């Protein structure tokens, strides 16, 4: 009957919701990694100063 179609659309959209959250969460993990890369440059600059000392 039509009940299966009603549930399938909600189930299909729910799966996309989890994928959207997972992709956004993955981007958050990537953003932290990218931010740490900028911090690593400061550590690299500090290391060069330590080498100069």
């Amino acid at each position: 009957n039509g009940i299966a179609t009603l549930l399938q659309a909600e189930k299909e959209a729910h799966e996309i919701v989890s994928k959207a959250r997972k992709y956004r969460q993955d981007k958050l993990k990537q953003a932290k990694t990218d931010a740490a890369k900028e911090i690593d440059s400061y550590k690299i600059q500090k290391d060069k100063e330590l080498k100069e000392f």
């Binding site: 009957n1 039509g2 009940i3 009603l6 549930l7 909600e10 189930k11």
Partner: protein, 265 residues
């Protein structure tokens, strides 16, 4: 419990010797009357409460038997609503599983397919078709389940907690067994209480009768009473003649002037 035929109540009537438990010997007449009346009234109240509890247990057992009889209005919800028609494994969907007679079931199904939000009338299907057991199953919204149930109740339809491939049947069987056990235990308790009460309340009643006889004797013949308190057990075929003879004999003391009491127990 001792059988009623072996109850010694007439044997006690043959003696009527007052005991210390029913009334203290040194207690005052008013105090003894109050104590005996209170104790016997408490016993009667306990007997009445036990009888009421036994009646309630019997009513519960009858309800369980009616549920097990197969009438879809009280039968297992598994067969009342078809698993396919009932909404399952869906967070946004729910079932009604209303039970009602043919006209009432049709009205409830129409209301569920119309009034309930996300009704999806194509999912409506009746799993039972008897005259008073024409219960039908629908797949409405999860939030609209309460509204559908309320509409069915207004439409003289009783919903049920239908569940597909669940332990509902086992739970119902266990509940019926527990109700039967509780009814049996309550019946045993009521039988024991009645067997004890038919003796205790009778003994208290005879103590009250003896105290009233003594009070009447001291009121009529003065103090000290010195009255020949006697109990006469007339045969059933000559109760009226015995009463007439007693009334005639009591005329020398001049209701009759002499203290006379009639007991049919």
């Amino acid at each position: 419990t001792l059988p009623i035929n072996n109850m010694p109540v007439p044997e006690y009537l043959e003696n009527f010797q007052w005991q210390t438990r029913k009334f203290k010997l040194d207690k005052s007449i008013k105090d003894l009357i109050t104590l005996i009346s209170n104790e016997s009234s408490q016993l009667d109240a306990d007997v009445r409460a036990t009888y009421a509890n036994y009646n309630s247990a019997k009513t519960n057992l009858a309800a369980a038997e009616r549920k097990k009889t197969g009438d879809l209005s009280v039968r297992s919800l598994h067969d009342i609503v078809k698993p396919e028609d009932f909404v399952l494994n869906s967070e946004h969907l729910t079932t009604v599983l209303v039970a009602v007679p043919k006209s009432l079931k049709s009205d409830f199904e129409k209301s569920y397919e119309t009034l309930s939000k996300n009704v999806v009338p194509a999912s409506a299907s009746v799993i039972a078709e008897d005259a008073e057991y024409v219960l039908f199953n629908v797949h409405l919204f999860k939030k609209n389940v309460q509204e559908f149930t309320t509409a069915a109740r207004e439409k003289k339809f009783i919903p049920r907690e239908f569940n597909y491939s669940e332990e509902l049947i086992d739970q119902l069987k266990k509940e019926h067994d527990s109700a039967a056990s509780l009814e049996q235990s309550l019946r045993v308790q009521l039988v024991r209480l009645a067997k004890t009460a038919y003796v205790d309340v009778f003994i208290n009643w005879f103590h009250i009768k003896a105290l009233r006889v003594y009070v009447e004797s001291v009121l009529r013949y003065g103090l000290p009473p010195h009255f020949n308190i006697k109990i006469i057990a007339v045969p059933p075929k000559n109760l009226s003649k015995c009463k007439s003879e007693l009334i005639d004999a009591f005329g020398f003391l001049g209701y009759e002037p002499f203290v006379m009491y009639i007991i049919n127990l």
